[PDB]
Amino acid sequence: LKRVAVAQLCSSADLTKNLKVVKELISEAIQKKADVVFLPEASDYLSQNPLHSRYLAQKSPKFIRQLQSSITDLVRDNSRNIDVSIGVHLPPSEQDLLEGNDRVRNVLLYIDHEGKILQEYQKLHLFDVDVPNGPILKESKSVQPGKAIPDIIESPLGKLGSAISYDIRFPEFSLKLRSMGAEILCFPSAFTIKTGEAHWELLGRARAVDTQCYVLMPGQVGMHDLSDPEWEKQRRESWGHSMVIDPWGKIIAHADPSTVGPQLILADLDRELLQEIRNKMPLWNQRRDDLF
Amino acid sequence: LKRVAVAQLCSSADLTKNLKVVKELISEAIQKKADVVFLPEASDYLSQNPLHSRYLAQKSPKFIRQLQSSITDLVRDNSRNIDVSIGVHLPPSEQDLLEGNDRVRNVLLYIDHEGKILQEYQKLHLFDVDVPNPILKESKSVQPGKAIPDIIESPLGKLGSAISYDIRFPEFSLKLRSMGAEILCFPSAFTIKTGEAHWELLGRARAVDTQCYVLMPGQVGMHDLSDPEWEKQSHMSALEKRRESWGHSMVIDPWGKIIAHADPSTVGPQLILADLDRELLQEIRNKMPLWNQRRDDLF
Ligand SMILES: O=C(O)CNC(=O)[C@H](CS)NC(=O)CCC(=O)C(=O)O
Ligand SMILES: O=C(O)CNC(=O)[C@H](CS)NC(=O)CCC(=O)C(=O)O
Ligand SMILES: C[As](C)(=O)[O-]
Ligand SMILES: C[As](C)(=O)[O-]
C-alpha cells in the first residue's frame, strides 16, 4: 500500500495567493505521509478572458521556479520525499509567436522530490462547449492544443498516465494510456457546475472501470475570484467533489462538501487489488485489435 | 417522439415456453404503440453447460422461423408495424465444422415488420471472467464474431447493435457512433455481482461518451435450466444437474439520464417504454461537438 494525496483548491487571478495555498497543501501532504500529491488544472491562475490569460501566463515561469524551490525546501524540512503533479499555464514559445500562434499552453507538470520537472503534458482536447444551462466557453481562443501523447511516468505510486479535465471525455486516450502500461490515471480539472453535477463522478468511475486503473481526480471548487485591480485599470465556478477511485469503480476517497476552499484527501493504493481485478477480468487479452 | 419498447424477461431452457413469453411481449409492445421492441441476449434459451448449449442451438432456427411468422401475424392482426431486435443462438455452419469449430453463435437479430431478418450480429467480445464473490467461460460454448455490425436504418433512427460484454470495450461503442449511430442497444444476460457494480455505470457512460440514446434489455431472475429429455440422453444424476441475472432494464438519454427503468416489484416479464427525441440528441451534439474535436492525428 502506497499513499496518495489529492488536492482541492480555488484558484484566483492572483499567483502569489495561489502559490501560498499550493505550498501549504503540499506541506500538509508530506506530514500525512503521501508519496505523491495531485493538484488541479490551472492551479497557478484562472483568468477573466483570453487577454488576461496571456497577461498572467507571463508570470507562470516565475510561479514554477518558486514552486520547485519550495518542494526541495519542504522535502528537506520534513525529512521525507514527495513528488508533485500540478496543472499550470505556460506562455507561447519564441518559435510559437513567429509561427503566428500567440496562445498559452494548458500544462500538467510532474515534479520529483529533487524539484526536477519530469513531464510537461500539454492538454490535447480543448473545452469548446456551449454548456446546457451554463456558460459558452471556448478554450481554444486562449489555449493552444498539445502535440503528443504523454509518456507513462514511473511514479512512487506505480505507473502513471496523465490527462487534463476535458481529456476524460475521449475514452480512446485513457485506453491508450492503459495499453502503454498505466496503473494509475489522473484527471486534474477545472470542471464547470452543470457538466460536473451531470458527469464528473460518472466519467471518473467509468474510466476506472474501463481501464482497470486507480483514478485520481483533483478538482477546482466554488466561485473563483478573478479580481485583478491592476489589470482591470492599468465568470468561473467549479464543481469540486475531488475523489480517488479504485480499479473496480469504487470511490475510496472524496472531498468533504462542507469545508469551503482548500482541502486535502488521502487514499492508500493497493497493487495487489489492482492485479487481482485485471487477472479476474483480463480485458487487455480480450480486445479485438484485428477489428478496432 | 419515436416510441421504443425494452423487454425484460427470464429465459428457461425451454424454447417453446420462451417463445410464448416473447410473442406476448411483442403483442403488448404493438398495443402500446412502440415502433421497435428490444429483447435481451439469449431470449431463445439459456443452457446448463456448453454441451447443453450446442444441443439447444439446434432448436433455434425453428424458434426464429416461428417468431418471424408471429411478427407478421401480430402486425396483420393489429394493423400496425413493429420491428424486433432479439438475442438468440445459432448452430455452427458447415464451414465452422470443417475448421473444427463446433461452437454456437451468440447472435443479435434484427427482424422487420415483414418478418425479414436484416441483421445477424455475432457477439465480438465473449465473457471469460472470474466473477468476484462463479467462474464463467463463454468461449467454451461460443465462437467469437468476426464482423463489425452495420448501422441499421430503423423506424427510430440510426441503430448500432452490441451484446452485453461488448459494453466493456468503449472503442466498439465509439466506432458505432463514428459510423453514424444515434441509438445503441446492449441486450444482455448480466451477472448479479457485475450488474450490481457496473450495469448502470456502463450504460450511462456509453450514453455520455457517444451522445446516443442507450437501450438496455436485460435478463432477470433465477433461470430454470431443467431439460429432463436432454438430462436423460446425456445420463446426468441429480448432483450433476445455475444462472441468475441482474435485470434493471433501462433506457438512457444522450446526456446520461435514465428516462425509463424496469419496475423492481414485478417478477418475470415486463416491458418499459420511452419516447425518443432526435432534436434532444441533435442539440446535445451541437453544444458539445465531441466528434469534431477528437485527435485522430494521434489515436
Ligand atoms: O480556462 C483555463 O484557464 C483552463 N481551462 C479550463 O478551466 C477548462 C474550461 S475553458 N475546463 C475544462 O475543460 C473542464 C471540463 C468540463 O467541464 C467538461 O468536460 O464537462
Ligand atoms: O452462455 C450463454 O448462452 C451466453 N450468455 C450470457 O449471458 C453471456 C456470457 S455467459 N453474458 C455476458 O457476457 C454478460 C456480461 C456481464 O455480466 C459483465 O460484463 O460483467
Ligand atoms: C501492459 As497492460 C497489462 O496495461 O496491456
Ligand atoms: C436465423 As436463420 C436459421 O434464417 O440464419
Swiss-Prot record, chain A:
Residues annotated to bind substrate: R169, T195
GO MF entries: [acetyl-CoA carboxylase]-phosphatase activity; deaminated glutathione amidase activity
Ribosomal protein recorded as keyword: no
Enzyme Commission number(s) of this protein: 3.5.1.128
GO biological process per UniProt: amide catabolic process
Record-linked CDD domains: nit (cd07572)
InterPro entries cross-referenced by the UniProt entry: C-N_Hydrolase, C-N_Hydrolase_sf, Nit1/2_C-N_Hydrolase, UPF0012_CS
Domain CN hydrolase: 2-271
Gene3D superfamilies: Carbon-nitrogen hydrolase
GO CC annotations on file: mitochondrion
Residues at the catalytic site: E41 (proton acceptor), K123 (proton donor), S165 (nucleophile)
Protein localization: Cytoplasm; Mitochondrion
Pfam families associated with the record: CN_hydrolase
Keyword terms, alphabetized: Cytoplasm, Hydrolase, Mitochondrion
Catalytic activity: N-(4-oxoglutaryl)-L-cysteinylglycine + H2O = L-cysteinylglycine + 2-oxoglutarate; N-(4-carboxy-4-oxobutanoyl)-L-ethylglycylglycine + H2O = N-(2-aminobutanoyl)glycine + 2-oxoglutarate
Family: Belongs to the carbon-nitrogen hydrolase superfamily. NIT1/NIT2 family.
Subunit structure: Homodimer.
Known function: Catalyzes the hydrolysis of the amide bond in N-(4-oxoglutarate)-L-cysteinylglycine (deaminated glutathione), a metabolite repair reaction to dispose of the harmful deaminated glutathione. Possesses amidase activity toward deaminated ophthalmate in vitro.
PANTHER family assigned: DEAMINATED GLUTATHIONE AMIDASE (PTHR23088:SF27), NITRILASE-RELATED (PTHR23088)
Protein name: Deaminated glutathione amidase
Organism: Saccharomyces cerevisiae (strain ATCC 204508 / S288c) (Baker's yeast)
Organismal lineage: Eukaryota, Fungi, Dikarya, Ascomycota, Saccharomycotina
From Swiss-Prot, chain B:
Single Gene Ontology MF annotation: [acetyl-CoA carboxylase]-phosphatase activity
Biological process, per Gene Ontology: amide catabolic process
The entry's keywords: Cytoplasm, Hydrolase, Mitochondrion
Active-site residues (renumbered): E41 (proton acceptor), K123 (proton donor), S164 (nucleophile)
Keyword Cytoplasm included in the entry's annotation: yes
Quaternary organization: Homodimer.
Protein name in UniProt: Deaminated glutathione amidase
Lineage: Eukaryota, Fungi, Dikarya, Ascomycota, Saccharomycotina
